[PDB]
Amino acid sequence: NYEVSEKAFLLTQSKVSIEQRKEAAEFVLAKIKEEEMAPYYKYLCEEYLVNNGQSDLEHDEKSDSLNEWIKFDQELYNELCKKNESKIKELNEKIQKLEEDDEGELEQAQAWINLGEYYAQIGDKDNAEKTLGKSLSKAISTGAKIDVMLTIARLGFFYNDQLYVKEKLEAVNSMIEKGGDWERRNRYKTYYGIHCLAVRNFKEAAKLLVDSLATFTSIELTSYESIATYASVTGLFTLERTDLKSKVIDSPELLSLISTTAALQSISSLTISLYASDYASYFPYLLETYANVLIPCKYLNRHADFFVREMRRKVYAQLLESYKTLSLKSMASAFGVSVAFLDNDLGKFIPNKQLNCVIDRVNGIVETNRPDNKNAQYHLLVKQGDGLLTKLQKYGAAVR
Amino acid sequence: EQKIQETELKIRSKTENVRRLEAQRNALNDKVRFIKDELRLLQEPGSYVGEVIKIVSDKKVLVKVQPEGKYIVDVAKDINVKDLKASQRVCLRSDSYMLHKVLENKADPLVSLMMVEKVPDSTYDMVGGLTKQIKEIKEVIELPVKHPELFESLGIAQPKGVILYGPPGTGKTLLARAVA
Amino acid sequence: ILDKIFYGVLDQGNGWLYVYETPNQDATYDSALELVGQLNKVVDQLFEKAS
Amino acid sequence: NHKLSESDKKSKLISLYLLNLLSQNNTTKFHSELQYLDKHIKNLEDDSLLSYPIKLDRWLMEGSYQKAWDLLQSGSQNISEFDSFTDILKSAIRDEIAKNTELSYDFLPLSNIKALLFFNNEKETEKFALERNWPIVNSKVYFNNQSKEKADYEDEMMHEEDQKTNIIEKAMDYAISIEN
Amino acid sequence: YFKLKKLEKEYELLTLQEDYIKDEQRHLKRELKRAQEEVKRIQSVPLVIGQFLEPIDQNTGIVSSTTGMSYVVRILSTLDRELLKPSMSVALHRHSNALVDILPPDSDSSISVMGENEKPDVTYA
Amino acid sequence: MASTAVMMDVDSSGVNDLHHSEKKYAEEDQVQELLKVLNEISKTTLTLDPRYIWRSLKDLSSLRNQELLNAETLCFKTIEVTAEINCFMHLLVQLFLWDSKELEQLVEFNRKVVIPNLLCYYNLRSLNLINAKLWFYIYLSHETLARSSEEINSDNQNIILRSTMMKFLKIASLKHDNETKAMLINLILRDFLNNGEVDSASDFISKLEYPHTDVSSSLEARYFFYLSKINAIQLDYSTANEYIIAAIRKAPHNSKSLGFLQQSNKLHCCIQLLMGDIPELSFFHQSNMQKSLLPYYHLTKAVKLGDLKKFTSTITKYKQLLLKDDTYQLCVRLRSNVIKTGIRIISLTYKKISLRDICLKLNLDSEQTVEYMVSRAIRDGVIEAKINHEDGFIETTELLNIYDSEDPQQVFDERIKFANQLHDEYLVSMRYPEDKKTQ
Amino acid sequence: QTNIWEENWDDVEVDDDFTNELKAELDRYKRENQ
Amino acid sequence: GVEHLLRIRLTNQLKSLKGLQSKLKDVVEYLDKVIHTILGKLQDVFNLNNLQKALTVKTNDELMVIYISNLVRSIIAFDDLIENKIQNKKIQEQRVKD
Amino acid sequence: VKRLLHVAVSDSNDDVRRAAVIALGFVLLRDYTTVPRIVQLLSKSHNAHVRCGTAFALGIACAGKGLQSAIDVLDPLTKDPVDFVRQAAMIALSMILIQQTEKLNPQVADINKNFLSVITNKHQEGLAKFGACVAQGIMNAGGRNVTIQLENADTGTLDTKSVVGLVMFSQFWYWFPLAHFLSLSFTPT
C-alpha cells in the first residue's frame, strides 16, 4: 500500500528524472506482481494517464508516455482474479464457516479484516469497506474499530484521499476518546496530520504531526522518514521559530534520522542554514530543498508555492524582515542577486497584506510601520452576521 | 363607484395590526397568568415523599415515609393499586396522607460483602494469549450463556458453575469479568 | 526574541538596522470570531434539526 | 427595427451628440446611452466619430488626456463640425487635471502646469490658477490648500459620533426597549 | 359606492378593534411588572436549613431536612437544572416548606465539623 | 389518466373553490405549488380535449378552444367562472413550450385572454393570478425576433405591452395590485436591457420595489438583478452589488441557479472588478464557467495584474461572450484601474519614490503622461500620494491610521442595523406560529 | 479543479521557483560575476 | 410601604442645566448684586471643554470592542426560539392526531 | 373606551379597574358583539377584580341578549378561585340567561345547579351562594316570566331606569342594601 501510493505519486509526478517515473513503478511493476494491484492500478494507470502515464497494456499505450511502466497484462487480472477469487473463496466459506459455526465475532470479523486487507493489496476501494462494515458489525472492540482507522487509512491514502476517511478518522476517533490509548491518537494525528495535510495541515496538524514523533508511523500507511520529513517541513515552514528552534533546532528524533535518509539534509537543516540567516546559501537551499522534497512527496508537491514562496516570504518576514530599513540595494545587491527581480516578488509582498514592508524602487529603500490594532477585530466581523444572514434568510426560509 | 371601493383595502389592510396585538395578546397575556400562576403553589403545606411498604386490596397503599414510620394510606385516584410497588417513591398528599402522585422508585443493590456489581465490563483480549482458556471459558460459559440450547439440543445439563486452575494473578478477575 | 524578528533592515552605505514595537492590540474578536464562528454551525445544525 | 429607413450622419449626429453628452459631462447617461444604443460595438467601433467619446472617455474618464486632448485637435469631426465642444472640452479637460495637479501637487512650476494645461502663454494658465484661486509665486503655481476644507454645509451630521450612536444606543436600547 | 356604506363602515369597528388592544397591551405589560415584583418578593429569611437531594422535575425536587425530613418540595423558579445544583445546602421555607435557595457555604454540623489546621505547623522530613 | 390530470385540476379547482371561498393564501400558494406540479401530468391530449368538455360550456372556453384546435368534442355560469380563468391561467401554463411551440398564436390569445373578461375586475380578487411573466414569457420567446420585422411599426405590441403592462401599472392600484408589477418593469427593465437606457428606472425606482412581502423572492431578487444593472452603467457598484448582495441565494434558485444565477453571478463578478476587489474565484471557478465566470477570471486573471494588453486580450477573446452578456462596456475602465492598482503596490511603500522610478513603471508604460497618469491616478484617490515635478519626486503618503475612529463603528451600525436583524424578524415570525394557534 | 486545495490568494503565479534558481544561479552567477 | 408607592440613563443628563442655569446668572447676580474672590476661585477650574485631543478619539478604540457582542447580544435570539418554537409548533401543529 | 381601558390599564386600585371594566359595557352597550372578544383579554388576567369587572359589563351587555359564546367565556371565571369572582360571574350569566333556558341553552341546568351546587356547597361562600341564590332568583325574577331590557330595539331607544339598578347594584358587597334597584330593568314578556 504505502510506497504504492507514493510510487504512484512518484511517477505521477515524474518531471525531473525518468527515475522519478522509472524507479517508482519499477517496484509497482514488481508490486503489481507482488499484490494484485490492478483494480486501482487500473485507474492508477488511468491516474497519471494522459500525461506520461499513457502507456498501458489495458488503458492506453502512447509514445508521449515517458512511462511505459504504467502498463498491465490481462494475466495480472488472471493472476488477480485467481488471487482475488482465491482470497475471496478462502475467506468466503471461512467467513461463511465463521457464520456457519457462529465462530467468534471478532473472529468472524477476523477473516473480514483479512477480506478487507486484500482490497488494499488489490486496490479495491470496496468490499473491504463493506467488509469493514461487516467487520465493524462484528466488532465488540474499539480494537476492531481501530481497524476502521487501519482500513480507512488504507482506504483514503491508498489513493491519498481526503475527507470521508478523515471524517471516518474523525468518526472512528470520536467514538472512543481512548484515541487507541496513546497510540491511535497518533495514528489519528498522523493521518489527521495527513488528511489535513491535504493540502494544508499548515499551522494545524503539522504541529500534531511534529507533536507525536517518533511515536508511530505505519509501514503500509506511512514510513518513519515520511512523517519526520513531512512533519519537519510544514511545521518548520509554518510553526513558531521558538518552537522550531526549541524543537526542530534539533530533536533526538531529528538527531536519529539526520542525513540518515540524506533526502532531507535541507528541510530544517538547510533551513537551519536559513535559520543561520545566510543571504544566498539558503536561497539555493530553497529549490535544493524544493525539488528534493516538495515535488517528490505527495502533499509536498500539490501545495507547492504555499511553501515557496512563503518561506521565500519567510526569508523576508523574520529573517531579512521588511526590512524596516537599509537601502534595498544592500539587500538586493550586496546579497549578490537580481536587484529588480528579487525586489519584484519581494514587492509582490507589498500588497500581499503580509508586508509591513514599506518599499521604494527608485531609492531601492525599504521601511516598516506598526500594525495598529487592526489584526482581525471587525474585518472578519462581516462574515458571520452574513453567516447569520444565511440563516437569517434560511430562517426566514424556515417559516412554511 | 369605485369611490368607496378600495376604501376596504385601507381597513382591509388594517387586518394585520389586529393580529400583531393578537400576537401580542398571547405574547403578553400568556406571561401574566403564568407569572401569576406560580403565586398559588407558593402556598403549599408541603409534599410528602413516601416509601411504600406495600398495598392491599383496600386500595390504601401500605407505606413507611422515610423520616416517618409506616402508614397504610389511600392512593391518588389517578394510579392503580396494580401499577404500584413497594418502596415506591411517591408524592404523598402531605396532610391528607394519600398519594399525591408517584415518583421514580429508587433501587437497588445491597452490601455486607454479598453486594452486586451488575454485568461488569472488561474485554477478554486484554489478558490475551490465554484464549485457549478463554475459548474453553467461552465453551464452558459463553456458549452455554450465549446459546445454552446447543447443549440442550445435545441434551445435557450445561455447566452451572466453572473452574479455572493455573497461573495466578493476571487480573484474573478480567478473565471472569470480560467473559461475564 | 520577541519572539521574534531579526530584524529591521541593515544598510551598506552605513552599517546598522532599524527598530519597532511589540504591544499591538488586545485579543478580542479573535476571542469573539471563534464564538460567532462556532455559533452558526450548531445552530445551522439546529436549523437542520427543525427542518 | 428601424431598417425601414436608415441613414449615415445619424451616426455623426449621435456621435456629435454623445460627444455633446460627453461635453455635457453627464457620465452615466452618456454611457447608458451607449447602453441605450441598440447595436453598440457594431455601431460604435465602425465610426471614428463614435470612436471619439469612449476612447476619449478612456483617456478622459481616469484623467490622462494626452492623446485624447491631442486627438480632438486632430479630430476630423472637430475638423468637420465638432469644434464646438472641442474648445469647451479643452477647458473642460484641464479643470480636472487642474484638480489632478491640485491633487498631485502643491507647488508646481508655472511652466509644468502650462505644459500640463497645454498652453502657450502661462498667463493663460495664470488666469485659471487665479481663476481657480490658486496660491502662486513667480514661476510656480502653489497649492497651500488643495481643497475646500470646512466651508459651511455638510455639518451637524458626522461628526455624528455619539449622537447618532447615542440614538443608535437609544435605538438599540429601544431595539432593547421596544423589543417589549 | 353602495353596499360599502353598509359594509365598509362596519370596518371602523375593526379599526377600533386594534385600538382596543394596544391599550390593553400596556396593561399586561405593566400588570406584569408590579406583579413581577411580588412573585419575586415571596422569598424570606427565618428559614430552616437542609440539603437538596435531587429534582423530581423542573420546579420539583426532593431535599433533605436537617430535621430528618426529606420531601417533594417546590423550589426557586430562579434555579432550573443549570443553576439548580445536584445536591445543595438549601434554604427551606418552613410550612410552604419549599426550597428558598441553595447555600454556597458552611461546614460543621454533625458529623462534628472538620479537622482544619490551615497552614499546618509541621515541616516534612 | 386525463382524469388524474384533470383530477389535479379538479383538486386545484377544489382549492380554487378554497379561493372561491376566500383568499387563496393556500389557493395561490396551492396554485403556486400546483404550478410546480404543472410539469408532471400535462400534455393536452385529452387534457385540453376534455377540458373543453370539462369547461363546457363557456364562450371563452370555446374561444380558448381556438388554442386547443384539435379533435375533442365529447359531452361532459358560476362553478365555470374563475376556474376557466384559472384554466385560462393554465391556458397560459399550458403553453410553456409545454403544450405549445409558437405562442404567437397565443400572443393574440394572450390579449384575447387577458383583455376579454380578464384584466378587468380582479384588483383584490385575482391575486397575481396574472402571471405577466407567463404573459410576457410568451413574448420573451418571441423576442427571439429578429423575425417579426417589428413589425408592425416598432415594435408596438411590445410597446403596447409596456403600455399594457402600464395598463396594469395603471391597474397597479397599490391595493395589493402589486406582485406581478415590477416584472412588468423587469420586462421594461430588460426591455431597456434589450435596447434601452433604464433611466426611467429611476422613475420606476420612483414608484417602488415590488412592495412588498407577498412577492416571490425570485422576482424580488430578479428585481434587484436588473436593479443592479441599473447602477451598472449608473456606475454605482456597491448598491448594484448590494442588490446582488440582496439577490442571490436569497430567492432560493437552484434550478434557476444554473442558467439564470450565472447571469446574476456573471454581473456579480463584474462588480468587485468595478471595485477592483477581485474576490477569490477559487469557488467561482466552479458552478461558473463552464458557461459563466472564467472570462471574468481571465478578467480577474488580468485584473489581478491588469496588464492592458493581456487584459484586452481577454476581452479581445471573450468580447463576444462579453457581447453575449453585454458585459463588454465594462472592464474598459478597469484597464488602467488595475494598472493604477499596481501603482499603489509599485512601492508607494516608500514615502515616495522619485519621479522617474514611479515614472519608470510608466517608463515601463508611457512618459510624462506619467504626470497625467499619476494625476490620472491621484485624481480619484485610489492611491494617496503626492508629487511635485519641480522636485520630480513622487511622494507616496503614509496611508497609515491608528484608527480609533467611527470607521469600524460605522461597521457596527451595520451590525447594529442587524442587531434587530432577525432579532426583530423573530417578532415578525412570532405571530405566525402563535396567532395560527388562535385559529 | 479537484475539490479542496488550500484555495485562495489566489492561484498566485507560476514559473518562479526555478526562475528564482535560474536567477539564483544567475544572481550568484552575477555574484560569481561579482 | 414605599413599595406600595410609585406604581437606566436619561435623568443622569437632565441636570445638565441646573447649576449652569443659575451659575452665570449667579455671577450676574453677584455681578449686579454688588452692581467675591470665591467666584474667581470657581473660574480657574472652568478651563478644567475645548480640551479635546486625539486622546479623545481613543474612545472609539474602546467603543470598538464595546460593540463586539452586539450581534452576540442578540445572536442567541438570532438562534433559538422560533427554531424551537417552530419545532414546538411543528410538534404542536403536527400534534393534531385525532 | 380607550381612556377607560387605559385608565383601568393605568390604575393601581383594582376596583376602579374592575369598575372601569364594568362601565365599559355601558359605553359598550350598543355592541355586546365584541364585548366577549373585548373581555377575552380581561377574561384572562392575573387579577380577580379585572376578571371580576369582566363579568358584569359583558353580563350586562348581553343581559337582554344571547351569546352563550359570551357566556361560556365566563364559566372559567365562574371557577376563578375567588368566590366573589364567580359570584359576579354567577350573576353576570343569569343577567343574560333569563328566559334563555332549557335546551335553547342547555347550560342553564348546570348554571342553575351550579348555584344549587354552590347553594348545596358548604365550602362555597356566602359570596358564592349569595350571587348563586340571587342569580337563581335573577333568572326567576318576576315569576321568571320577565326580562331585562335597555336601549330596547322595542323602542330602539335607551331607558335610564333600566341602567340604574345596575350602577346601583354595582357597589353591593360594598353597600349591600341596594340591588333591589335592579327591579327596574325587569321587563314583561
PDB file of N, CA, C and O in Angstrom, chain A residues 61-86:
ATOM      1  N   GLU A  61      -1.586   2.973 -24.540  1.00  0.00           N
ATOM      2  CA  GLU A  61      -0.148   2.902 -24.789  1.00  0.00           C
ATOM      3  C   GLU A  61       0.222   4.002 -25.773  1.00  0.00           C
ATOM      4  O   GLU A  61      -0.175   3.954 -26.943  1.00  0.00           O
ATOM      5  N   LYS A  62       0.994   4.975 -25.303  1.00  0.00           N
ATOM      6  CA  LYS A  62       1.324   6.155 -26.083  1.00  0.00           C
ATOM      7  C   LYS A  62       2.816   6.445 -25.993  1.00  0.00           C
ATOM      8  O   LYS A  62       3.442   6.253 -24.948  1.00  0.00           O
ATOM      9  N   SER A  63       3.379   6.898 -27.114  1.00  0.00           N
ATOM     10  CA  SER A  63       4.775   7.315 -27.127  1.00  0.00           C
ATOM     11  C   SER A  63       5.005   8.488 -26.187  1.00  0.00           C
ATOM     12  O   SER A  63       5.994   8.515 -25.445  1.00  0.00           O
ATOM     13  N   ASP A  64       4.090   9.461 -26.195  1.00  0.00           N
ATOM     14  CA  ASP A  64       4.227  10.626 -25.326  1.00  0.00           C
ATOM     15  C   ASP A  64       4.104  10.249 -23.857  1.00  0.00           C
ATOM     16  O   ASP A  64       4.255  11.109 -22.980  1.00  0.00           O
ATOM     17  N   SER A  65       3.809   8.987 -23.569  1.00  0.00           N
ATOM     18  CA  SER A  65       4.059   8.481 -22.234  1.00  0.00           C
ATOM     19  C   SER A  65       5.537   8.189 -22.092  1.00  0.00           C
ATOM     20  O   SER A  65       6.060   7.266 -22.722  1.00  0.00           O
ATOM     21  N   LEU A  66       6.206   8.950 -21.236  1.00  0.00           N
ATOM     22  CA  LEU A  66       7.560   8.577 -20.887  1.00  0.00           C
ATOM     23  C   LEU A  66       7.563   7.369 -19.977  1.00  0.00           C
ATOM     24  O   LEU A  66       8.579   6.675 -19.879  1.00  0.00           O
ATOM     25  N   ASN A  67       6.445   7.099 -19.322  1.00  0.00           N
ATOM     26  CA  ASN A  67       6.295   5.886 -18.548  1.00  0.00           C
ATOM     27  C   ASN A  67       5.576   4.852 -19.385  1.00  0.00           C
ATOM     28  O   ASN A  67       4.391   5.005 -19.692  1.00  0.00           O
ATOM     29  N   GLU A  68       6.293   3.799 -19.738  1.00  0.00           N
ATOM     30  CA  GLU A  68       5.645   2.587 -20.195  1.00  0.00           C
ATOM     31  C   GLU A  68       5.220   1.697 -19.039  1.00  0.00           C
ATOM     32  O   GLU A  68       4.348   0.843 -19.218  1.00  0.00           O
ATOM     33  N   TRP A  69       5.788   1.910 -17.852  1.00  0.00           N
ATOM     34  CA  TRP A  69       5.613   1.014 -16.715  1.00  0.00           C
ATOM     35  C   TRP A  69       4.228   1.100 -16.120  1.00  0.00           C
ATOM     36  O   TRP A  69       3.918   0.375 -15.172  1.00  0.00           O
ATOM     37  N   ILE A  70       3.397   1.966 -16.676  1.00  0.00           N
ATOM     38  CA  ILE A  70       2.016   2.166 -16.274  1.00  0.00           C
ATOM     39  C   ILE A  70       1.193   1.144 -17.061  1.00  0.00           C
ATOM     40  O   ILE A  70      -0.030   1.251 -17.192  1.00  0.00           O
ATOM     41  N   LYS A  71       1.907   0.172 -17.637  1.00  0.00           N
ATOM     42  CA  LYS A  71       1.386  -0.985 -18.358  1.00  0.00           C
ATOM     43  C   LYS A  71       0.764  -2.039 -17.428  1.00  0.00           C
ATOM     44  O   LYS A  71       1.005  -2.065 -16.217  1.00  0.00           O
ATOM     45  N   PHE A  72      -0.050  -2.922 -18.031  1.00  0.00           N
ATOM     46  CA  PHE A  72      -0.613  -4.121 -17.406  1.00  0.00           C
ATOM     47  C   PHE A  72      -0.271  -5.391 -18.163  1.00  0.00           C
ATOM     48  O   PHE A  72       0.617  -5.418 -19.021  1.00  0.00           O
ATOM     49  N   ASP A  73      -0.945  -6.464 -17.768  1.00  0.00           N
ATOM     50  CA  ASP A  73      -1.369  -7.503 -18.687  1.00  0.00           C
ATOM     51  C   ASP A  73      -2.701  -8.033 -18.185  1.00  0.00           C
ATOM     52  O   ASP A  73      -3.081  -7.824 -17.031  1.00  0.00           O
ATOM     53  N   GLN A  74      -3.435  -8.688 -19.073  1.00  0.00           N
ATOM     54  CA  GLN A  74      -4.635  -9.367 -18.619  1.00  0.00           C
ATOM     55  C   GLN A  74      -4.306 -10.540 -17.717  1.00  0.00           C
ATOM     56  O   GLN A  74      -5.153 -10.956 -16.919  1.00  0.00           O
ATOM     57  N   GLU A  75      -3.095 -11.087 -17.840  1.00  0.00           N
ATOM     58  CA  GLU A  75      -2.622 -12.079 -16.884  1.00  0.00           C
ATOM     59  C   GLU A  75      -2.722 -11.546 -15.473  1.00  0.00           C
ATOM     60  O   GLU A  75      -3.153 -12.259 -14.564  1.00  0.00           O
ATOM     61  N   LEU A  76      -2.313 -10.295 -15.275  1.00  0.00           N
ATOM     62  CA  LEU A  76      -2.453  -9.635 -13.991  1.00  0.00           C
ATOM     63  C   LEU A  76      -3.857  -9.872 -13.477  1.00  0.00           C
ATOM     64  O   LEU A  76      -4.033 -10.346 -12.359  1.00  0.00           O
ATOM     65  N   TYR A  77      -4.851  -9.607 -14.321  1.00  0.00           N
ATOM     66  CA  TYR A  77      -6.230  -9.918 -13.973  1.00  0.00           C
ATOM     67  C   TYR A  77      -6.402 -11.397 -13.690  1.00  0.00           C
ATOM     68  O   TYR A  77      -6.969 -11.780 -12.665  1.00  0.00           O
ATOM     69  N   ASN A  78      -5.907 -12.243 -14.587  1.00  0.00           N
ATOM     70  CA  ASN A  78      -5.950 -13.680 -14.352  1.00  0.00           C
ATOM     71  C   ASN A  78      -5.266 -14.024 -13.042  1.00  0.00           C
ATOM     72  O   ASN A  78      -5.851 -14.661 -12.158  1.00  0.00           O
ATOM     73  N   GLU A  79      -4.019 -13.590 -12.904  1.00  0.00           N
ATOM     74  CA  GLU A  79      -3.305 -13.554 -11.640  1.00  0.00           C
ATOM     75  C   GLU A  79      -4.226 -12.995 -10.565  1.00  0.00           C
ATOM     76  O   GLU A  79      -4.549 -13.685  -9.594  1.00  0.00           O
ATOM     77  N   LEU A  80      -4.653 -11.745 -10.751  1.00  0.00           N
ATOM     78  CA  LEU A  80      -5.609 -11.124  -9.842  1.00  0.00           C
ATOM     79  C   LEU A  80      -6.813 -12.016  -9.603  1.00  0.00           C
ATOM     80  O   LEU A  80      -6.993 -12.554  -8.507  1.00  0.00           O
ATOM     81  N   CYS A  81      -7.652 -12.171 -10.628  1.00  0.00           N
ATOM     82  CA  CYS A  81      -8.933 -12.839 -10.452  1.00  0.00           C
ATOM     83  C   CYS A  81      -8.744 -14.153  -9.722  1.00  0.00           C
ATOM     84  O   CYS A  81      -9.481 -14.468  -8.785  1.00  0.00           O
ATOM     85  N   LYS A  82      -7.713 -14.909 -10.101  1.00  0.00           N
ATOM     86  CA  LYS A  82      -7.334 -16.064  -9.299  1.00  0.00           C
ATOM     87  C   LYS A  82      -7.043 -15.658  -7.866  1.00  0.00           C
ATOM     88  O   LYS A  82      -7.749 -16.074  -6.941  1.00  0.00           O
ATOM     89  N   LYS A  83      -6.000 -14.846  -7.668  1.00  0.00           N
ATOM     90  CA  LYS A  83      -5.689 -14.360  -6.332  1.00  0.00           C
ATOM     91  C   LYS A  83      -6.952 -13.863  -5.668  1.00  0.00           C
ATOM     92  O   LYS A  83      -7.335 -14.322  -4.587  1.00  0.00           O
ATOM     93  N   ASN A  84      -7.634 -12.947  -6.347  1.00  0.00           N
ATOM     94  CA  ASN A  84      -8.899 -12.390  -5.906  1.00  0.00           C
ATOM     95  C   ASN A  84      -9.819 -13.508  -5.456  1.00  0.00           C
ATOM     96  O   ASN A  84     -10.064 -13.672  -4.257  1.00  0.00           O
ATOM     97  N   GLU A  85     -10.275 -14.314  -6.414  1.00  0.00           N
ATOM     98  CA  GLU A  85     -11.081 -15.490  -6.117  1.00  0.00           C
ATOM     99  C   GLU A  85     -10.476 -16.288  -4.975  1.00  0.00           C
ATOM    100  O   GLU A  85     -11.126 -16.510  -3.949  1.00  0.00           O
ATOM    101  N   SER A  86      -9.237 -16.745  -5.159  1.00  0.00           N
ATOM    102  CA  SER A  86      -8.526 -17.485  -4.124  1.00  0.00           C
ATOM    103  C   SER A  86      -8.722 -16.824  -2.774  1.00  0.00           C
ATOM    104  O   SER A  86      -9.300 -17.427  -1.868  1.00  0.00           O
TER     105      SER A  86
END
